[PDB]
Amino acid sequence: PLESQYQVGPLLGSGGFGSVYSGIRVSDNLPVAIKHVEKDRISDWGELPNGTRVPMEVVLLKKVSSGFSGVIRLLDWFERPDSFVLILERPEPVQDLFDFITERGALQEELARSFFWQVLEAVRHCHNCGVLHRDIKDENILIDLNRGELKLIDFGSGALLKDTVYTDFDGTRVYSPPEWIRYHRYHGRSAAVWSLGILLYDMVCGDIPFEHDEEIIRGQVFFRQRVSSECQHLIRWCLALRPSDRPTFEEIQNHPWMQDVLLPQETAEIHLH
Numbered sequence: 001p002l003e004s005q006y007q008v009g010p011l012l013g014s015g016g017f018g019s020v021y022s023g024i025r026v027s028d029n030l031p032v033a034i035k036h037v038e039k040d041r042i043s044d045w046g047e048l049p050n051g052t053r054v055p056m057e058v059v060l061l062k063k064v065s066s067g068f069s070g071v072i073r074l075l076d077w078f079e080r081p082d083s084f085v086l087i088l089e090r091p092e093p094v095q096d097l098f099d100f101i102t103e104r105g106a107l108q109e110e111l112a113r114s115f116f117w118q119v120l121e122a123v124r125h126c127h128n129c130g131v132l133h134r135d136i137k138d139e140n141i142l143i144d145l146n147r148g149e150l151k152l153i154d155f156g157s158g159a160l161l162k163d164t165v166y167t168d169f170d171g172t173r174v175y176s177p178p179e180w181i182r183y184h185r186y187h188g189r190s191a192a193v194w195s196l197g198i199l200l201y202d203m204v205c206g207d208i209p210f211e212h213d214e215e216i217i218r219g220q221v222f223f224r225q226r227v228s229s230e231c232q233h234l235i236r237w238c239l240a241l242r243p244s245d246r247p248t249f250e251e252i253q254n255h256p257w258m259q260d261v262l263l264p265q266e267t268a269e270i271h272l273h
């Protein structure tokens with residue numbers, strides 16, 4: 001019934017997340033994304049309300065797909081003999097933030113502010129649903145170009161959020177915090193804040209601040225592009241070497257650089273249309 005219920009279009013991409021295709025739900029004409037993962041490539045398993053064996057990714061997605069948010073929602077899923085297939089929302093027209101930044105270079109602060117704020121609201125939403133993403137980065141953010149709305153993707157490296165230490169990680173090394181690099185240990189929220197500092201630098205500079213392990217550990221931030229003092233300060237705070245010196249989400253969102261955020265639609269009219 002996956003074959004009759006969905007019409008398959010082109011391959012959008014493939015990678016550690018599997019293979020994702022453009023698609024249409026035949027019932028209405030809802031644009032969707034169809035994501036295939038081989039069972040043998042799934043190390044992380046969990047269990048449902050009734051309790052079948054599913055990828056952890058499905059558990060995490062169900063927990064965050066209830067109601068609206070800045071997260072791409074799981075609409076349905078299917079099990080095949082050797083794979084799982086996930087049906088996800090697909091905005092149209094859409095561009096990922098990595099491609100967007102590659103094309104336009106460094107973002108104006110007004111645009112970075114609106115984008116970053118929406119990322120924060122989306123991550124707070126995950127954390128409130130009990131989910132830690134663990135791979136927040138430009139390539140895992142989609143822009144709905146008409147509404148100016150940002151949407152999180154790829155919970156395949158994620159976990160249930162907890163207050164105790166994580167000693168495993170399968171996200172992106174150059175967004176991973178120094179405590180992971182040095183000790184193979186981190187706590188959820190403070191690691192997420194570090195990766196948010198990396199993302200914000202990426203937005204306002206057009207590239208990531210650290211390539212090598214030693215630079216991450218050193219934690220000295222050099223600005224290659226002109227960036228306001230208030231924005232440099234927020235970035236340097238998120239990228240504090242000691243986890244406990246980093247801001248909470250509330251402190252990030254009350255920071256002076258974060259005031260007077262544009263609405264998504266305004267953001268699209270000014271910067272995206």
Ligand SMILES: Clc1ccc2c(c1)N(CCC1CCNCC1)c1ccccc1O2
Binds near residue numbers: 072088094139155
């Ligand atoms: Cl339109 C669309 C909707 C929903 C999507 C996805 C796309 N993707 C693909 C992301 C692009 C990034 C640029 N390079 C190619 C893959 C996705 C990738 C991994 C997990 C879930 C995903 O859920």
